[PDB]
Amino acid sequence: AEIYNKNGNKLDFYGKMVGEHVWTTNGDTSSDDTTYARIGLKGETQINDQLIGYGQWEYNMDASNVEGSQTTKTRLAFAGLKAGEYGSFDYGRNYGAIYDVEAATDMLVEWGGDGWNYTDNYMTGRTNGVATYRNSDFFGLVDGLSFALQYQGKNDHDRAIRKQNGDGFSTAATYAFDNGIALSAGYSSSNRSVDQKADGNGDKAEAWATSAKYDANNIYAAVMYSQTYNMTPEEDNHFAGKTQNFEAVVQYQFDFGLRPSIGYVQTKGKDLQSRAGFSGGDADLVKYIEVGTWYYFNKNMNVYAAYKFNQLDDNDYTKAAGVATDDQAAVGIVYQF
Template identity: 50%
Template structure:
């Protein structure tokens, strides 16, 4: 039963890259594990915003308590601290914080800051050493990545009747306050991008056996009044009363080989542009997104990786007209080398395929330069 409880946390654990944890307490039906990592990273790029030290630390815990024979309580907290700035100007934030209950084969219910159900699909291609998982996935952006006010029901093996068939139902409450985080979105100045109205989502995965699996997810939410008003008329900000997304994926994970492909479409939610308020940006009316990843795990610890990611926006308003434009497009070549279960080194090269001399990217503060990342990770 405890393995089933921990299985409910697998999407979040994969997203954090936390493969191991230190058990600090396990007695009388109560268990508490501590996990963390130090990622000593440096990136090289002609774009100043992507060049320099990127070192950070993550800490967290996951625990469970046996309430009765069938009822188990569980919780998780994950905190990230940047270590690449002076002590008087550091950045830290909560990535995850949720608690819930699981009752036998009837599933689990938890609430708090968690991953949206669309990420159940996206996690399959968010596997690169540094980059990846960013064609349309932004945190605090509806039920795509991490977000606040997530109420999630999960069921594994369909009430214990169909092995390998899992599904999730999710509700997200209204988040309209200014200054909400949007880590990774590149539009930190735009509070509209991190707002959301009430919404719901659903996801499902099925393991066919022999390494093959499929996944699908859908979400729909009200847009806030401020978002809808900003998109009225000819504007870089999407119109419409609702924000919708769907995603589907396939993967093969066996015999040391990992192959995955995901496709997704978003409407009235995906942000683009710079975090510098002096530059442009907006919210796309529609994006179509594809991510493909191939990796191989050698027995001596080396894991090379190849990937391609693209996000194409439809009917973007710019320079007095509407047109289609790639917001993200790059190939990625990388590798991780696991020296043991607690230590690894990595290199990851992002080959940016956006047009360097395009005024749309320049005027919206979208980088078109390649990035090389190297680093070492100690994790427990």
């Protein structure tokens, strides 16, 4: 909500309170509260006729653990300049540029966006130390054609190997048409960290992705294909040498507020490393269908429910790596502002 707008400077203080509960089932049902709150700020200042300054901060607060044991997280923290057809530049903790391509299918009710995209994993999600140049309409020449060019410095110490990265870059472009179709494509290439390279599997972490979406006439549909190389962490902290990823989603928005959704997520690992209990070879890392619904009361209140049909089978890989194969269900109630 906009809580300040004076002298050319605006502040939007936004957030949500999410009451949520999640069940897991297959061999005995169990369930947990997963409630949280999130707050953030978007600031904007008019500097001159061609320049605007901006900042964003976003902060997660767990409320499912006891007081004294709840984690907090700064999800985003960046500042930038934007100059019309010249583009924009921002720096700090932000989304990776190749995540532009994942945004279309990362629209599920409870899950989604968890195949080849991870928090603090190169530029596949939110991440530290990214400098990002963007341009919204190709220098004023092509309405609806936008792109991003991003640099990330090494984050190679005082964090888990699974979350490390070396220096690298990512890029993405999106062409949005008036009829509601949008196409995206993007790329990521980085050096690995010294601690990662000691696994002997190579010196670079790389990825490419494509997506298509239709968003009009109360219908939403999207598909995404991607591949990653030495980038996607496994549950036992190995990196997959290669992945092949596909996602799809279809939703319909009724005028009275109901919004049903069916989504599909698959991440197939290729030639995964041998390890205790697993002789090596291909294995699925992530494979599920989500069926669910929202009911939107208004822009400030919603409820939702979802079920995950987990398509992974108990096998040598899932046992060795520690991958969950059980189905899940969730419900929630959200106030937002």
